Design a protein around this ligand. Structure first.
Ligand code: HEM
Length: 396
């Protein structure tokens, strides 16, 4: 009954055997070691305990299992992490995010306008994937005419930061970083010359304790915002909508009562957990929930496993938009708790509301399909999602 798994193999997260493996871990070895000896916290309690002990469970070795740390806030410990976060968080105040509703809602209606006359689309390719990229592109000063070029960068940049870059990909990947770097430094220079109220303008002016973000830091932190908030948000939108359609009583409940939308978004986040893991590196030997851990090794925090922990969530394989409490760990916990969580929730809220209203009879093309998942060991979710609906006229 024990799973024979490599937690650094993206195929594990795409196999649809992962939650069965998680169940074995939570029941039998809550701090699990995989077939290569990699440690992983599988229970909600173990994930929370590690998050609450950043001096023992550090981010400064990097958040990926077999990669060096990068000079960005997520690979830093406090108090230096706080300064970097304080500087960047000026772009993500509650007002600034709330003020994005008008533009985000307009993006949602434009995306739905593009497919509403067809009566079919791919929910991932045509709705869930374009929205987070357009939202982040808008904040970074990407013209809609530059969205094609910017979109190729964003896909190739995921490969750049991934665990293995093939010989055949090395060129396009370093070319994507260079292109992103050059583009971003141009935007930075433009806002230092002529400030506006976009994200880069806010970041170039941000000052904490007489310290500002350097140009190097601005490229790194905007890159973290782009990669961190693009595919993740996409996967919650698609996988959450998949669950509304597979449990159509939940779709009907939400369609009938807009006040259920916040709870629905939280259940979509709990269920989809697009960030499958973040690593911590041990700063000392320790005994952790029955497993001996050694100084210098990394442990994965399995957020999806935690989100299906029966110790915290009653009937966790039931998708329930009215679930309360719903203290899921899709955004993590503690000092690195997702900086983009309010923006992600707003994108998800606005798009889901518009889909339920404008594609009211949305359905999966084939409910017996096992839809394909991205075989990546870090962020994963649906690769495609064919849907059908009654055509309607665009709002234009
Ligand atoms: C549904 C979408 C999202 C998910 C599931 C998600 C998930 C996460 C997770 C799990 C972490 C690490 C927390 C931890 O280790 O405890 C994180 C950190 C972060 N996320 Fe997100 N995220 C999402 C959307 C976004 C967006 C839209 C942004 C854009 C600003 C963003 C920017 C960040 C940043 C900058 C960090 C690093 C925070 C820090 O180190 O202090 N994320 N996110």
């Amino acid at each position: 009954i024990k799973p024979d798994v490599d937690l650094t193999d993206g195929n594990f997260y795409a196999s649809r055997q992962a939650r069965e493996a998680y169940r074995w871990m939570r029941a039998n070895q809550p701090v699990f070691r995989d077939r290569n000896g990699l440690a992983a916290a599988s229970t909600y309690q173990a994930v929370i305990d590690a998050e609450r002990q950043p001096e023992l469970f550090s981010n400064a070795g990097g958040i990926r299992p077999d990669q060096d740390a990068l000079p960005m806030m997520i690979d830093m410990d406090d108090p230096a992490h706080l300064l970097r976060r304080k500087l960047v968080n000026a772009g993500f105040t509650r007002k600034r995010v709330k003020d994005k509703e008008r533009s985000i809602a307009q993006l949602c209606d434009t995306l739905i306008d593009a497919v509403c006359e067809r009566g079919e689309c791919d929910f991932v390719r045509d709705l869930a994937a374009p929205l987070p990229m357009a939202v982040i592109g808008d904040m970074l000063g990407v013209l809609p005419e530059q969205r094609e070029m910017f979109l190729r960068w964003s896909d190739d940049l995921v490969t750049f930061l991934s665990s293995h870059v093939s010989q055949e990909d090395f060129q396009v990947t370093i070319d994507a970083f260079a292109a992103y770097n050059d583009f971003t430094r141009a935007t930075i220079a433009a806002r230092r010359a002529e400030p506006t109220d976009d994200l880069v303008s806010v970041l170039v002016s941000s000052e904490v304790d007489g310290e500002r973000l350097s140009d190097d830091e601005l490229v790194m932190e905007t890159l973290l915002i782009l990669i961190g908030g693009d595919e993740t948000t996409r996967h919650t939108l698609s996988g959450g909508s998949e669950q509304l359609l597979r449990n159509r009583d939940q779709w009907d409940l939400l369609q009938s009562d807009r006040e259920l939308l916040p709870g629905a978004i939280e259940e979509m986040l709990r269920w989809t957990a697009p960030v499958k893991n973040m690593c911590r590196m041990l700063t000392a030997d320790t005994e952790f929930h029955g497993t001996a851990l050694s100084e210098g090794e990394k442990i994965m925090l399995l957020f999806e496993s935690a989100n299906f922990d029966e110790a915290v969530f009653t009937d966790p394989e039931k998708f329930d938009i009215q679930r309360n409490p719903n203290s899921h760990l899709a955004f993590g916990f503690g000092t690195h708790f997702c900086m983009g969580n309010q923006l992600a929730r707003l994108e998800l809220s606005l798009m889901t509301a518009r889909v339920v209203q404008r594609l009211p009879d949305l359905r999966l093309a084939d409910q017996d399909s096992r839809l394909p998942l991205r075989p990546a060991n870090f962020v994963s979710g649906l690769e495609s999602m064919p849907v059908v609906f009654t055509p309607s006229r665009p709002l234009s």
